[PDB]
Design a binder for this molecule. Sequence first.
Ligand SMILES: Cc1ccc(COP(=O)(O)O)c(/C=N/[C@@H](CC(=O)O)C(=O)O)c1O
Ligand SMILES: Cc1ccc(COP(=O)(O)O)c(/C=N/[C@@H](CC(=O)O)C(=O)O)c1O
Lengths: 396, 396
Amino acid sequence: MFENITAAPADPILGLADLFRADERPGKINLGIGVYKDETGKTPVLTSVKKAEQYLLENETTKNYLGIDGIPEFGRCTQELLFGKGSALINDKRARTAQTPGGTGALRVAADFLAKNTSVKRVWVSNPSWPNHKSVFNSAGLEVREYAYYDAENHTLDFDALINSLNEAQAGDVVLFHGCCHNPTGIDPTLEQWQTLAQLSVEKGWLPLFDFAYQGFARGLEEDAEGLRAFAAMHKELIVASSYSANFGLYNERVGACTLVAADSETVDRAFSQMKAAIRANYSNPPAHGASVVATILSNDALRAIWEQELTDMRQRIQRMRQLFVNTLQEKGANRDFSFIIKQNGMFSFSGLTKEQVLRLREEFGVYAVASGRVNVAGMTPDNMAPLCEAIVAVL
Amino acid sequence: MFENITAAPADPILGLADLFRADERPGKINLGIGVYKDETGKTPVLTSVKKAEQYLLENETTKNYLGIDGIPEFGRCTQELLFGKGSALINDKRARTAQTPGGTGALRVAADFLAKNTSVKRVWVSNPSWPNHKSVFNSAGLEVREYAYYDAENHTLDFDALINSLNEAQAGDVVLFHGCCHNPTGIDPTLEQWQTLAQLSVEKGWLPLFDFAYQGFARGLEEDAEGLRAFAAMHKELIVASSYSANFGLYNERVGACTLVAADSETVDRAFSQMKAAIRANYSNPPAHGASVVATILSNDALRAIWEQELTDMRQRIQRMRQLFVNTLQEKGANRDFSFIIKQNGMFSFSGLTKEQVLRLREEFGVYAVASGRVNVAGMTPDNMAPLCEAIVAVL
Ligand SMILES: Cc1ccc(COP(=O)(O)O)c(/C=N/[C@@H](CC(=O)O)C(=O)O)c1O
Ligand SMILES: Cc1ccc(COP(=O)(O)O)c(/C=N/[C@@H](CC(=O)O)C(=O)O)c1O
């Protein structure tokens, strides 16, 4: 049965870990996968998380199965983060949330739900995007089409090209939007742009799917949700796939959510019954530990205050690194202007490096980035900045 | 988009929780979903698990992502449980394991891997089986066909009917086998029967898929794997979907494994690369907490000894309940012979009750079973046995 199976191609992101682990050179520098590091080059457990885990160890008295949709308090806390306290979507009972194994699991549940229960055949994704978006949607049988997004000459969102690309989308197609901290560009719509897209989407009949992996890493928790909220004010229906991996430092615990919104509570409840059936046929019900840590933190004033500050600390450290990177490239003799990196949002920016420069940086200098030129600024530290920048200048 | 979605049908198992929770009557008795209860009618965290969780709280210093296939030590420990220390499959590097979100996730990963990478179109499942097997396989695009299994007049495995049914399977079809503690019948092949099926499967070209949700609940950890090991000795290729939910009391932490076996290490590694690609497009990588508890326990002599005894304790308590149930039915005036229940394995036996008897038991008596007549013996206790039996006698 398995004699002719052809090997799969390298995961362009996750595959970097095997290479990095196998690299026995001392001064190797990891700017690949999107995990936050602190000033020591490590990814500690958040203190709020350790406190919540201690509380769970002391107080949990069963591991009996969650419901298919997971912990109810987690769902309520997720909806309040997405839509705001006092949102009409919440008051009108228009949204149902399933806790999922990560943001990736939330994207797969959304795709399986749409493929099996709606007329959807195509999802529109930005060029460029996270490379796993295409794989997730195709695995559910959905075609992926690309829309233009990025002007690489001026390092801006090419809004006119984006609009033009999307004119080819039919009513009933899905359009995927990154909620904030676009991966890989770091370039997000302004609020006015989000409002223009919300009105356009209603006019053209697109179903919005928001992917919200980095809420809190651009400007703040509420500010980062403004684009999604502008869409929510205008649309009867949308889907949000969100993740708590980065903003709680809970990557390996697989904590995400798929939130379905419909015109009214009767419709969302009927539609959600099919989303639950799609989950039951995949992984049955979701992992409790990470979600119970998030719900424990978000529902306790003291833990929530500690956590919000830890998130602010991460965001501010990445901003300090963007500035230190730009300043150090100049000092090490880089040819050009990299000042666009300062304005960008989230863990990632596009260095502008070619696929060959990125390969040379790994092979010759032990500096690991993604082949698209995406660099994880959150992997930069005061201690590794100089060698990193010297290596980059050397490949320019 | 969602205006016409038809509501999904009740999950015949998981749906019982909403009904049971909503039932405000005092003496309600839960014999539905397959979760173990102790003599108090509760599902505590195992002591070995609490000890391992304390160790993790003290010693974990990151939540950085696992590999797509999860914790390497967990994979090694799973293979040794499945195949035995010193197995040729392990020595020859013929098996690769992915840690998955539960046994359900392992079944879905297997199905997506087979659908996308092999000629498989059909999976053969026993009539009766767990009702979610059909949903999982159909969600991946595979047809499900049934094979005869159970003689309900004599309460035995109808081996001749099983063989006859399977003559219709073509070479390259998958046949699903429950490794031990068949759900819902509790009736497993004898070792000779397993050996006969292993030889038949090789002759007819079937790809075996073992589902191993209850290792340790029939007779013991090694004894329960004898049928799988008889198949492993005869086959170049097979797949095992296993779960640690019941045997570690870790249901909500989603701890399972998908193990692929091929003729040699080159083939299994090539085939496994595609299994990893199927996982990446589903939930990306698996939840660490529960798997790290299992690996911590299985790799430490002291914790492993505590755990093995806790599992023996669960198994023996269920056996005591089978005997107490049979004795108490007789004392409360049940018409017939229920002595077949004593011989059966695992959490479940078929009571023989009709779908209407089961509905009446819920509506009139607050006793909750599955509509197939399956009862969770592990939900029975000395304190609830008399009212339970009185109710059953009342509906006969
Ligand atoms: C836009 C976007 C959507 C969804 C995910 C997956 O997050 P999860 O851990 O499943 O909650 C990522 C994550 N990107 C990271 C890590 C990854 O590739 O797995 C990255 O781009 O390096 C992402 O960047
Ligand atoms: C044969 C079989 C294969 C796979 C599973 C799922 O276990 P997981 O928790 O995903 O590791 C069950 C579980 N059966 C239980 C609970 C359930 O239906 O979800 C049951 O039959 O009540 C099962 O009985």
